[PDB]
Amino acid sequence: LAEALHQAL
Ligand SMILES: [Co+2]
């Protein structure tokens, strides 16, 4: 989830 968020942002 951490990296999913970083990707989105
Ligand atoms: Co990052």
Q: Which residues surround ligand 1, an ion (CB under 5 A)?
A: 6
Return the CA Rg of the chain. Answer: 5
**Gap from CA of 1 to ligand 1 centroid (Å):** 11
Residues 9 and 2: their CA atoms lie apart, in Å, by 11
| CA atoms of 6 and 8, how far apart (whole Å) | 6
Resolution (A): 0.9
Quickly list DSSP for the chain. -HHHHHHH-
